[PDB]
RNA sequence: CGACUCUCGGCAACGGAUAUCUCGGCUCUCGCAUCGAUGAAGAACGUAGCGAAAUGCGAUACCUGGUGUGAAUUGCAGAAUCCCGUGAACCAUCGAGUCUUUGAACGCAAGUUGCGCCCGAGGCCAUCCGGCCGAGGGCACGCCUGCCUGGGCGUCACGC
RNA sequence: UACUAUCCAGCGAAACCACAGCCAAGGGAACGGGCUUGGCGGAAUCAGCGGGGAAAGAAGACCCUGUUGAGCUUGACUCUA
RNA sequence: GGAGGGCGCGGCGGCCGAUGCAAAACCCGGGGCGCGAGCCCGGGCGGAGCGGCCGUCGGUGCAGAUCUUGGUGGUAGUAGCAAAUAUUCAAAUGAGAACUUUGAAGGCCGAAGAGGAGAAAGGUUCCAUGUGAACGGCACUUGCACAUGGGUAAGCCGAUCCUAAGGGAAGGGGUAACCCCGGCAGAUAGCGCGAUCACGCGCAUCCCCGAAAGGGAAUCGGGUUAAGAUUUCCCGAGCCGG
RNA sequence: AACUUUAAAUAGGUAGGAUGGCGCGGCUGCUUCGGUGAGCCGUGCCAUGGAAUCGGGUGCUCCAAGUGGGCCAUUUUUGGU
RNA sequence: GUUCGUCUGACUUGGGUAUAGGGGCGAAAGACUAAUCGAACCAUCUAGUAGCUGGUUCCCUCCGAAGUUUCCCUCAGGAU
RNA sequence: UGAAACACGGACCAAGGAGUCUGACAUGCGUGCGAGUCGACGGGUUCUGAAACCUGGGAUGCGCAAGGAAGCUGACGAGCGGGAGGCCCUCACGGGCCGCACCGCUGGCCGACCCUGAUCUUCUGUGAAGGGUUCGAGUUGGAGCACGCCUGUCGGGACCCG
RNA sequence: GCGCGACCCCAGGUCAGGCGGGACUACCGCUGAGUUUAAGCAUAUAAAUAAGCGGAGGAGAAGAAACUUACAAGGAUUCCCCUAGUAACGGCGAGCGAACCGGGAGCAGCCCAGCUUGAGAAUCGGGCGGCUGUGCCGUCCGAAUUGUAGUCUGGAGAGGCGUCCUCAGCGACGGACCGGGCCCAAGUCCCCUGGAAAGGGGCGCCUGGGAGGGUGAGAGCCCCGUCCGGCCCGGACCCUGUCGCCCCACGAGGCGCCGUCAACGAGUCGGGUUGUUUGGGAAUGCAGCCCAAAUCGGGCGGUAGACUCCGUCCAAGGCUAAAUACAGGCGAGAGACCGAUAGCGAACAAGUACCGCGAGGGAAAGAUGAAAAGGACUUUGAAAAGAGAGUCAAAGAGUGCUUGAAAUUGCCGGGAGGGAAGCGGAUGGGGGCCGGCGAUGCGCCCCGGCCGUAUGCGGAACGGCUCUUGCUGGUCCGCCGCUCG
């Protein structure tokens, strides 16, 4: 999910540098021809020059694609479902939950056709699953570093994930803009949804029709 | 970042446009929040101002001043209002710039073309609400 | 025995590192086709009220028509009709324009604001209905097509 | 004898600097300002000076080596105008 | 030299904390912890964002490199500022005068000049007025500095016009092409003169640039401002071409 | 030293057992003129037990770094004053 | 600076003009060709190569070498 | 070899500043799945450079050996010694039984190579059968493939600089 | 001579029009190195690369087989996957080295020349008039028989016969595509701190929008935007969706069947030789030169050759989207990019200043603050400045300006001492400097203070378990009663 990026591939390459050689108490590095300027790094086929290139520092090669094995991936996806049926991992990941009488949540199929966010928070409140989304509508971190100057002003904590089991890939529109939320269908579930940061046991909300489709993902 | 194939989205670009403001850019950024009485007449929360309006400082330290908008400055996007001032050392009084967001519109000159803005935006707010 | 030599702190001066900023760079990705003798790419020199520069423009010179927006421009000065308006604005659009001097650069040259030629109209007065003077713009290489005067037993007829 | 130096008022660099600066002998990268052992042991200094700092300027131009060049020569190898 | 276990920095996914009632940063012969890498905390300075922990990743840690770039010493207030024959006195002005300016005096270059001008070159430096922040390695009120203004006027002088050595379009031909020789069927392809009348007659090695020095159409005098004046200006007198 | 019948010392090799011996009885193209023999197979018997001593264990395999200029002393020794 | 070579010709010197990089020019020194000449300078190929010199960046732990064998245009280095 | 060296560099300080990244490789280690394995050229789809889904595969392996043609065509199927551990007996010491990992060794089988050549047969094919101081990255009871990381290796400017 | 037409060849500052240069990222050709590598170096490698040169477009090149193959044959061209890190080639050394098939993406097919208009150049350019005009019509000159118009293009096709089927050209209105304009939710409520509140606290609302920026400190709700929709407007336009008018037919072509034919591109084929290039090897492509054909024929078939077969296409003319490229230009979206010695040479007047005779070389340089509120005035000084003051939340922010490190410098203090020898440290002691040092502990009894168990009551989360169901064990709180502590 990462672009390739790099240092310039023609960089400080096209800089004229020719050496004095020796007969000078000046290091045997190439040197600018132009003496008649108030500065500029003194010749620049170096790794050792102000404003010159460096032989390494990136340049388009670096694979930002690592191949995944589907059988390997299948095990990881399957494991992620199981992490919601053990409460210990949910607690460990740092979900605040006052939640229901039973272990993973199964919900009625009628929360697909929910337009409003106002309705969406209300239904979650009844469950007690609104709790961690309330902890992500505040305590939202202005992230340090250069990320502020990109577009990454706020990194929002990860609360409820809702997974629908409507066949035609139907995004519940209301649930998309809730603080700390993610939205998924069964037809697009991935490891990173159920385990941001690689830490399995995110609190997830399963639709009834979603529940029996989770089988067909692709000692003990 | 967040969604959509569109022209505009870039943290640098947003800053670039609004600082140096071309005329259309100036007028939309010259939109200053209405006072509550006016909000229920024209059915909008904010409209572009004028020079023959009167505008009241709500937000700042300078709060409680009222005056007419003397000038509007493009180059560094600022507006200048009468009686919001700081005093120079000699005793000269020079206006202190205020952002149009900070200040709130007391009184309107309707005009004819500015009046058209009120009608279109009002129609806008009617459509969503009902 | 001051002092000197040395050291540190506290306050400073020096210096511009560090932190925190960034209308910028950088790299990737996407869309798009669209220069010119109909005078280009590039240059030069001018033009703003007050400008050195950058930016803009070309004797119609920091701009014009038209159009959109609908009142600013501002450092100071200024106009006040241009403000309930065929209309403010270092404005945006900019369809209609001018678009200098150069430059492929074209009358010919060019270390030359160099040296020709031609035509236009207005005025004059008839040493002629012509002479003189005016402002503007042309007059290259290249070759097609159509065109004229013809070279030449090139080829034919017809010549005396 | 002039003009300096010197001394003044003003003005004012650079080269160079691991850290510095008293000798003797000893051993030691086999010739020490420093170590070891003896002798010593002026603050603060100026004008001088050319022993020393194997002082400084210059990756010794020589000399050797590099599977490093280039100028030249030819009865080198191999091509060619 | 290998392997092992850690620490610190920057950014990213997670998670938790901290803040204008004072963040980060920086300072601290202040305390304490860890074998260390480092960490912690206080006080001072400061004024807007930041750190810890779990994953992830690097343009990731410096003492050097006859290192690169910036700053700053000792050297050192030391070498020096010594060629060109040389200054001095009084006055003026100004806060302040060996150096400015004026006089007086002494000198110097010694007309192949340290001179009056033009070339080339520079480009306003010339002159006034303002005037000492920088600069004239002293000084300074002075300046060829800085600021502000002005100034170069030609029928006759030059360029122009003209040819030289020579350069170069045009033609033919190589060279893809750039580019180079250089003319050809301008030779019964047209330029030139009569000629106004439309027609006739005559001819090449063309045609331009090329010496602001060659060669050359044509001016003198007096006056003037900051200045060269045949030259700007003006009187008077010409001279050349149309 | 480039002679040796002769001839040391210090060095050097091998062996001191169960990875062994013995009994029983199988096969062969070998080997025997001959099951005669040889080798190799099944099965049985014999432990601390094959000198000494020790093994804060040993055996085995894969893979890679550095090194690839050495220098010195006692002793032995060649060249050379 | 002094001392001094030449100073009416193979003289001196300007301007215009010609010749440009394995090329020019040379009364010939390998001299000189814009502080540049045993092959100018500039940009590019080029971030060229170099068994060789320099430097090579946080800590602690545990183990711990070798300059020897063999081959090599190899004896300043590799393979083994 | 030995640096205090009469070796070489370094006045001082701040900030830059050098084993990197990749493609293809070996080993090791981890992960998945496993006689298979490897989604992503692609197509479906989308909350949009992603993620999700899926195709036939193709690549690599699952058999080889030759230069090549090719190969009765590689299935009859193995012993022995030391072997952890277990089993059995015994109070134990030990004995016996089964024996893995692994190691060493002796065979058979296959290809290449050389001999041997039945019955048969489209007329020279055929390959039962018995062997060999030859030789192979084989069978004789497979292990890979994909992904990743360190380190090694090569191309790349390639530790940095000349 | 005069040659009507014209023949052949010249000339117009000629009639209407056209070319150069740029761009050169990417592309299509041409032409062409060496460093390097082989630890040397020539063959070879680098590389059919860099340099040199020309020319177009938004893509370009390519393009309907003289193909690939050896099959129940594939089937223009391009690109990706694979073949492939391989066949091959190579001082067989270093290295060099692709295609065919297979899969996928994308798809699209065609017209001239070469058989006859010959009842007639039916065709075209120009001038001229008119017109609703990338055109159409009338008219007249001219072009062209050394051949225009043309059936027809190898898949074929022209003749003939017999049947059906099928057509040329218009309005008007949408959509498609592109560009704009414009609109599209909600607090500026109380309190505190501060210069300011966007901050904290109290209390709210909106959310297809809690992206971002702006704004006097972390702003969903202050403004702009954002999101999701709405409403306009102008382009471009035959891509198709509507409709509506002419039915374009007895034509032409298509189909079925039949015949006579089948015209199929030359210094090209092909070959030799030479050089260049190729993995291409008795020659891969390419070129020069030399030789040189045929049409029941010709070419190809990865080892030269003859022979016999078989297979496969049909050159030597030409067009044509898509799938493919993209360090330039223009207009956008982004990144585990960089954070002023970094990033581009350039964040700022940057290809600027400056350097060089030139070719070319080429910097340094961002930050007061919310707002200039950029220090009036008084005083000293020749002035520059200083000192007061004013201003500011802060001048410990005064255009050396946010923070203001190291080095160095100054002041001063401490230690030390002016009888003494320096690696600057370690080790020991003293001074100098400074932080630390149970909240002050326990048993017992008296008063003051507060609460109450057991057991009954009343409401419950629990247990072992069983798990329909059952039995044993709960503790606790509310708080009344009854006894005590």
Beta-strand content bin of chain B: 25-35%
Number of helices of chain A: 5
The total of helices of chain B stands at 4
Number of strands of chain A: 6
Beta-strand content bin of chain A: 5-15%
Helix fraction of chain A by DSSP (H/I, runs of at least 4): 10-25%
Biggest sheet record of chain B: 4 strands, antiparallel
PDB class: ribosome
Keywords: homology modeling, de novo modeling, ribosomal RNA, rRNA, RNA expansion segments, ribosome
Entry title: Model of the small subunit RNA based on a 5.5 A cryo-EM map of Triticum aestivum translating 80S ribosome
Chain A: 60S ribosomal protein L4
Labels describing this entry:
part of a larger assembly, 2 chains, A: 220 residues, alpha/beta, 4-stranded parallel beta sheet, B: 130 residues, alpha+beta, 4 helices, 8 strands, RNA-binding
Describe this structure in words.
The structure is cut from a larger assembly and holds chains A (220 residues) and B (130 residues). Chain A is an alpha/beta fold and 220 residues long. Chain A is 18% helix and 9% strand. Chain A has helices spanning 70-82, 87-93, 117-127, 191-194, 208-211; strands at 105-107, 141-142, 154-155, 161-164, 182-185, 204-207. In chain A, strands 1-6-4-5 form a 4-stranded parallel sheet. Chain A has a two-stranded antiparallel sheet with strand order 2-3. Helix content of chain B is 31%, strand content 25%. Chain B has 130 residues and is α+β, with helices and mostly antiparallel strands. In chain B, the strands form 3 sheets. A 4-stranded antiparallel sheet of chain B has the order 5-4-3-8, with no helix packed on it. Chain B has a two-stranded antiparallel sheet with strand order 1-2. The chains are: A alpha/beta (220), B alpha+beta (130). The chains hardly touch. Chain A binds 7 RNA strands through helix 1, strand 2, strand 3 and strand 5. The PDB classes it as ribosome.
């Amino acid at each position: 999910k990462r672009q390739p990026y790099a240092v310039s591939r023609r960089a400080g390459h096209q800089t004229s540098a020719e050496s004095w050689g020796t007969g000078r108490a000046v290091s045997r590095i190439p040197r600018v021809p132009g003496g008649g300027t108030h500065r500029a790094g003194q010749g620049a086929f170096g790794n050792m020059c102000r404003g010159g290139r460096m032989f390494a520092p990136t340049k388009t090669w670096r694979k930002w694609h690592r191949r995944v094995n589907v059988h390997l991936r299948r095990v990881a996806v399957a494991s992620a479902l199981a992490a919601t049926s053990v409460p210990s991992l949910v607690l460990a990941r740092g979900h605040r939950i006052e939640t229901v009488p039973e272990l993973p949540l199964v919900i009625s199929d009628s929360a697909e056709s929910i337009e409003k966010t106002s309705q969406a928070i209300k239904i979650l409140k009844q469950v007690g699953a609104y709790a961690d989304a309330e902890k992500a509508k505040d305590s939202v971190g202005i992230r340090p570093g250069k990320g502020k100057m990109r577009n990454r002003r706020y990194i929002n904590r990860k609360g409820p994930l809702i997974v629908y089991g409507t066949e035609g890939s139907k995004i519940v529109k209301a649930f998309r803009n809730l603080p700390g939320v993610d939205v998924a269908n069964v037809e697009r579930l991935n490891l990173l949804d159920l385990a941001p940061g690689g830490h399995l046991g995110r609190f997830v909300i399963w639709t009834e029709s979603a529940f029996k489709k989770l089988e067909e993902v692709y000692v003990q | 970042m967040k969604r959509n194939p569109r022209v505009t989205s870039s943290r640098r670009k947003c800053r670039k446009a609004h600082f140096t403001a071309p005329s259309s850019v100036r007028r939309v950024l010259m939109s200053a929040a209405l006072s509550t009485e006016l909000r229920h007449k024209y059915n909008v929360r904010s409209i572009p101002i004028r020079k023959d309006d009167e505008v009241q400082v709500v937000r700042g330290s300078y709060k409680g001043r009222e005056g007419k908008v003397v000038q509007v400055y493009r180059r560094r996007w600022v507006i200048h209002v009468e009686r919001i001032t700081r005093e120079k050392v000699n005793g000269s009084t020079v206006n202190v710039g205020i952002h149009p967001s900070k200040v709130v519109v007391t009184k309107l000159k309707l005009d004819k073309d500015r009046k058209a803005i009120l009608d279109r935006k009002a129609s806008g707010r009617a459509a969503d609400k009902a």
